[PDB]
């Protein structure tokens, strides 16, 4: 009849709150750590580059740029070499055009080389062609020439005064002289045996000459034969002589006086070609100075002039630089226009000089810009840097985050304990109270 | 009736590290209209120090010298006895010592004197009683004299 049971529970209830106390500590540690690490990272997250970019942004992108710049420099030096290869050819053309300028100068001015004012050779004196095969042939002639003129019918021989023309406009006097060129002199002895001997005894000043010898005499057939008419100058009736037939005894091949022979630009074209009848041959010159003897049959012949004063070109008035006027005053204009057509290419080479100079200067400036850039690149690669803080702060964030994860890993099972422990412990509370 | 008694037993909650003064609030606890009340009548002075003496047996007013003949309530001694955790007190004049000690200090023969006060007492623990008087002493002593270690060391090491 006693009251038996005593209190038994006050002690066990503690374990519940004892373990529950960790609910505060775990979450407090997690919150403190994560909030503090986030606050500290708030700085670094944007302060990694407070000063790093200002000077640091060059080195990397310019190190990527060097691959362009170095090869572009090589390319521009190579195209500068090609530019020099063009300029050297330009100055090759320069020396060439110098060659052509001297060439054209000489070609146009070689009218000076022999006939500038050569008209004044004798200068008020007197001279003759009577001994002209060498400058010393006069010893052959001077006072022994008289022993020739006795083998002849009316005198034939030197033709000295016979080759002089009376007045007459200058231009036409080429054809008859060209014709007589075949028989320029006609000394002779009738004997056929002395052919060599007489010419050989005529060697009183050597045999360095080309003396011609002719046996032919006056021809005989009348002057009333088919004479032409005067519309353009003819120089057959222009000579004084001992006998008229002197100027006719070669007519067999010098057929000039009995034809309607004309020139190229007048009297209907190409009647020279048209095989004239009742006459033998009438071929005529093409051009006044060098043009050949036009023909429509037997072929042409040249008239490239060759002659000299040989008696006196000036016999009434004697001086120069007045009458023969046009040639030099037009050769000056030829010099002028040749200079023009060469100075156009001189301006071309000047323009090419401007082009190459501008290209070279532009390339020099472009390359010097890149030289400064690559100097600064290769240089600032070795810049001052503060990488230490970046790594330190990143590591501080990382290790702290790992610690936070470790903290979080511990809460769940420790929290799980409490529910089952309380289920075990609590229900006796009502039990002892009911037992009371 | 009856159950009105227990109530104030929770008094032992007086244990408080942050105590600054208990002189007044301990008074009215005795109001009522037990051994716990008896020990309450004397224990409050322990907060000052547990090793003091103010004997009701000679005079509760004032002390005579600083010698006790019965000890300063020591806790350990390397040449006399290992630390104290379970003392048992006498019923006559406060003779007290460890429970587990005398069982071998008097192994076989009981009537022997007690070397504690230079006086004759030749009876042993079989007539002793449970000791509720010791509870406060070591508990307050350690709580008071261990908390000074942290502050000085912390302030000496925090210089930099």
């Amino acid at each position: 009849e006693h009251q038996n049971a005593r209190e038994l529970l006050r002690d066990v209830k503690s374990r519940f709150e004892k373990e529950k106390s960790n609910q505060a500590e775990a979450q407090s540690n997690i919150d403190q750590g994560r909030k503090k690490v986030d606050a500290l990272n708030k700085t670094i997250a944007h302060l990694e580059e407070e000063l790093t970019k200002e000077m640091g942004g060059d080195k990397d992108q310019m190190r990527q740029e060097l691959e362009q710049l170095e090869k572009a420099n090589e390319k521009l030096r190579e195209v500068n070499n090609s530019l020099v290869v063009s300029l050297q050819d330009v100055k090759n053309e320069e020396r060439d055009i110098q060659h052509e300028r001297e060439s054209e100068l000489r070609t146009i001015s070689r009218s000076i080389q022999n006939k500038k004012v050569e008209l004044q050779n004798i200068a008020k004196g007197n001279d003759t062609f009577l001994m002209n095969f060498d400058r010393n042939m006069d010893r052959l002639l001077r006072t022994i020439e008289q022993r020739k003129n006795e083998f002849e019918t009316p005198a034939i021989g030197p033709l000295g005064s016979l080759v002089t023309i009376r007045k007459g406009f200058e231009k036409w006097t080429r054809s008859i002289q060209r014709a007589i060129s075949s028989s320029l002199n006609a000394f002779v002895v009738s004997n056929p045996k002395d052919n060599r001997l007489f010419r050989d005894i005529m060697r009183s000043c050597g045999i360095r000459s080309n003396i011609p010898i002719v046996t032919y005499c006056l021809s005989q057939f009348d002057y009333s034969k088919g004479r032409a008419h005067g519309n353009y100058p003819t120089i057959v009736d222009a000579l004084e002589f001992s006998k008229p037939e002197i100027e006719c005894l070669f007519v067999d091949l010098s057929r000039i006086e009995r034809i309607v022979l004309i020139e190229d630009k007048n009297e209907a074209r190409n009647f020279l070609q048209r095989n004239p009848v009742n006459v033998n041959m009438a071929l005529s010159l093409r051009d006044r100075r060098s043009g050949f003897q036009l023909s429509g049959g037997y072929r042409l012949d040249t008239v490239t002039y060759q002659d000299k004063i040989r008696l006196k070109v000036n016999s009434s008035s004697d001086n120069g630089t007045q009458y023969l006027k046009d040639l030099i005053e037009q050769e000056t204009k030829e010099l002028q226009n040749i200079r023009d057509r060469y100075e156009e290419k001189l301006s071309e080479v000047r323009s090419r000089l401007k082009e190459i100079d501008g290209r070279l200067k532009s390339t020099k400036n472009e390359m010097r810009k890149t030289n400064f850039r690559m100097t600064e690149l290769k240089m600032n690669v070795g810049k001052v840097v503060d990488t230490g803080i970046l790594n330190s702060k990143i590591n501080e964030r990382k290790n702290q985050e790992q610690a936070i994860a470790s903290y979080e890993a511990a809460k769940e099972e420790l929290g799980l304990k409490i529910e089952q422990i309380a289920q075990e412990a609590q229900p006796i509370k009502e039990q002892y109270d009911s037992t009371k | 009736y009856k159950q009105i008694d227990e109530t104030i037993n929770q008094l032992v909650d007086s244990t408080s590290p942050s105590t600054i003064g208990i002189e007044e609030q301990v008074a009215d606890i005795t109001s009522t209209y037990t051994d716990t009340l008896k020990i309450l009548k004397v224990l409050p002075y322990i907060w000052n120090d547990p090793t003091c003496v103010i004997p009701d047996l000679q005079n509760p007013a004032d002390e005579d010298d600083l010698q006790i003949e019965g000890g300063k309530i020591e806790l350990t001694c390397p040449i006399t006895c290992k630390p104290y955790e379970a003392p048992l007190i006498s019923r006559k004049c406060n003779h007290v010592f460890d429970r587990d000690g005398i069982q071998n200090y008097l192994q076989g023969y009981t009537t022997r004197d007690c070397p504690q006060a230079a006086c004759s007492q030749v009876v042993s623990m079989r007539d002793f009683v449970r000791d509720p008087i010791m509870e406060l002493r070591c508990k307050i002593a350690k709580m008071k004299e261990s908390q000074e270690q942290d502050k000085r060391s912390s302030q000496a090491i925090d210089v930099l």
Partner: protein
């Protein structure tokens, strides 16, 4: 009435009091943190021990290395300023080699007779007229070339001997064998330049007097000693002159001695088309309107060089041209060799630039080493952030724990006063 609730408070203390240890335990965490961090700061001082301030010349070693890089650039530009001169020199050298080429061609001119025609002024027109025809094939039914180059006369005196065979005008004219082809040939050129042509109708080649014959004593093989050339040109030599009938005994003779031929021969009307004996040449024409007398007329001649394969000779030739040719060749080639040695100097300048690049590499290595040791200095400096992180953290943690102790313990101790509420409605 009723029996009242009695205490029912009892355990209310526990749920507040027991929280006292909550950060009294954290005190140990505080102490562990301070001790560990103080040891860390001692390690930071150990790091302080190795001062080695960055190298003494940073602020001016930077200027130095700047100077070396600008020296690299300067040397490169200086060397290229002369590689341009090398380009000029090599271009002039190749032009000089071209000059050497055409000079050698002019020198080693082959057996061809083209060169002789250069003696006269306007005959370069004929030269070009033949040159463009030679260069391009076209089609020539009867190919025809100036006869001067297409004959093999024996010697210069014999060249004179046959020079008056045809006139200078003829020598600058192109013969034709198919008389029908008057102008068919001239499609490209027509009449641009100064040349003419010669016709052909007949020719003859028979051995005259090849036996005991019209005279008493024999002598010599007849006048065909050696004259050969183009088929058309030789047909012309026959048609226009008939040289194959002149009675040439190389020694002395006179027309009176020739008069045994006065009577008719395969040669018809009295006398020949032409006579030549040594340096003496004769002309024949009919005296139709004279005394009907037979008349030969003689002319003397001198040396001629055309119609023979030896254009000029080593004795005179166009010779000083060869001397100047080789002379300018030698000067230009030796100038090119001097330029090549200057280019060897330029290659040594390239070597100097490579040595400058070695200097650049060494200086960059030194600067990179110094910058990595500056990174070590930055490592040393990070302890400042370390200690600043420690200082506020430790103090704030200790403040928080101490204030929690203060407040919570005071709150619990004051709640202990609830005890007074228990001395209550039981009696008085």
């Amino acid at each position: 009435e009723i029996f009242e609730k009695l205490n029912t408070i009892r355990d209310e203390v526990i749920k507040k009091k027991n929280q006292n240890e909550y950060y009294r335990g954290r005190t140990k965490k505080l102490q562990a943190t301070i001790i560990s961090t103080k040891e860390d700061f001692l390690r930071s001082q150990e790091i302080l021990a190795q001062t080695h301030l960055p190298e003494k010349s940073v602020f001016e070693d930077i200027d130095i290395k700047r100077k070396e890089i600008i020296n690299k650039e300067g040397e490169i530009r200086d060397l290229i300023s002369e590689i341009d001169a090398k380009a000029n020199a090599i271009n002039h050298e190749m032009r000089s080699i071209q000059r050497q080429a055409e000079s050698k061609t002019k020198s080693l001119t082959t057996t061809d007779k083209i060169g002789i025609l250069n003696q006269d002024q306007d005959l370069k027109e004929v030269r070009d007229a033949v040159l463009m025809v030679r260069e391009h094939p076209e089609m020539k039914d009867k190919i025809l070339e100036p006869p001067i180059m297409t004959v093999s006369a024996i010697n210069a005196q014999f060249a004179a001997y046959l020079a008056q065979c045809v006139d200078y005008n003829t020598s600058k004219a192109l013969t034709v064998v198919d008389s029908d082809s008057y102008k068919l040939f001239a499609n490209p050129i027509l009449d641009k330049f100064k040349v003419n042509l010669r016709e052909l109708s007949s020719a003859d080649t028979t051995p005259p007097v090849p036996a005991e014959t019209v005279r008493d004593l024999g002598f010599e093989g007849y006048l065909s000693d050696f004259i050969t050339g183009d088929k058309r040109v030789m047909k012309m030599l026959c048609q226009t002159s008939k040289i194959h009938t002149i009675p040439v005994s190389r020694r002395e003779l006179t027309p009176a001695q020739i008069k045994k031929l006065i009577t008719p021969r395969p040669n018809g009307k009295i006398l020949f088309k032409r006579i030549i004996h040594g340096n003496r040449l004769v002309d024949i024409k009919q005296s139709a309107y004279g005394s009907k007398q037979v008349f030969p007329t003689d002319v003397s001649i001198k040396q001629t060089n055309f119609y023979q394969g030896s254009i000029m000779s080593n004795e005179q030739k166009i010779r000083i041209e060869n001397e100047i040719i080789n002379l300018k060749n030698e000067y230009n080639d030796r100038k090119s060799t001097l330029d090549a040695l200057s280019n060897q100097k330029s290659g040594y300048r390239h070597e100097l630039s490579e040595l400058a690049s070695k200097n650049d590499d060494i200086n960059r290595e030194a600067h990179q080493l110094n910058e990595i040791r500056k990174k070590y200095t930055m490592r040393k400096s990070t302890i400042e952030t370390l200690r600043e992180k420690l200082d506020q953290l430790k103090r704030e943690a200790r403040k928080d724990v101490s204030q929690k102790i203060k407040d919570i313990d005071d709150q619990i101790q004051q709640l202990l006063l609830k005890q007074r509420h228990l001395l209550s409605k039981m009696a008085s």
